[PDB]
Symmetry: C2
Subunit: 147 residues, 2 copies
Amino acid sequence: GMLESVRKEWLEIMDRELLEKARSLINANYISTTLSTVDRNYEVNIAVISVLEMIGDDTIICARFGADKTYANLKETGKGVFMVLLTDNDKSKDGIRVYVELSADLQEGEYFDRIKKRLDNTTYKNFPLKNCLVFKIVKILPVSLLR
Amino acid sequence: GMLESVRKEWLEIMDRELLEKARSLINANYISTTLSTVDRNYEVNIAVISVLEMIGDDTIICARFGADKTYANLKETGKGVFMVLLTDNDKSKDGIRVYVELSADLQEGEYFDRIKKRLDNTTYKNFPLKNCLVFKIVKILPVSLLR
Ligand SMILES: Cc1cc2nc3c(=O)[nH]c(=O)nc-3n(C[C@H](O)[C@H](O)[C@H](O)COP(=O)(O)O)c2cc1C
Ligand SMILES: Cc1cc2nc3c(=O)[nH]c(=O)nc-3n(C[C@H](O)[C@H](O)[C@H](O)COP(=O)(O)O)c2cc1C
């Protein structure tokens, strides 16, 4: 009994490590960051989405300037997953998967304005910010569980 | 008329370009290759998947040795999207998106034998081949269509 109980302490520690790892990877805004989505007909999509910021422990805000299909999918089904994949293109791989649900679709506010400030310091500064998408974090997994 | 003919020609040249770019990137088997899937409840998953081969213009075969959730999703909905993304020192290099539908899940035959040979020459050589997944290619898009 206490052996299972100790394994749970352990698992909460693992979740905290994964959260902090996710925080650094997401806020780093690597160009190798994607968001996968789906429409009502089960057509899965994936697009590169890097203008991001993780707020607190359960929220990611995202700059939406392109991503037409990705945005449409989120409005229809609401579910998605972010992946930050880092690789040497040789032997090495690292990263994180953050499973998400769209919480808000904003055109103004401090969230809209803060992500707008972040967008202004990027190559896509010249692309009009159409939306600031707010996501709720559902689960964080390592890049690939392999037993 | 003339517009419809020239446009049909443009589409054909474009399609061949997409098929060839996809062929090269898929068959190279980069670490930075993924398969995004979904279940009946619209929950989207993404996993790293590089033991792959594109055959002709309509087929992708893939070794299934890990990827449990990915596999369960494919059996529920059958839909997915592969993405290859090359980035060098956080500089965008190239990539492709290949949209697919599961056609077959096999344990023997030409496809199984083919993907087995490939897997033998990998770090995952010791991982047993549980399935040869056969995909039909449904659409190929460039990485981003941002204007
Ligand atoms: C570089 C790399 C390539 C991989 N290629 C494959 C593959 O071709 N087929 C497979 O079944 N698993 C492959 N894996 C292992 C899966 O990514 C791993 O089993 C993962 O946990 C599956 O995630 P899932 O449970 O969300 O489906 C690969 C892993 C890495 C790091
Ligand atoms: C490195 C990189 C980062 C990008 N980041 C974003 C982003 O943060 N938000 C966005 O809307 N589009 C971004 N894009 C553009 C989308 O990927 C592009 O609009 C894509 O075609 C959308 O795909 P979709 O129509 O299937 O949703 C980025 C593109 C690149 C190459």
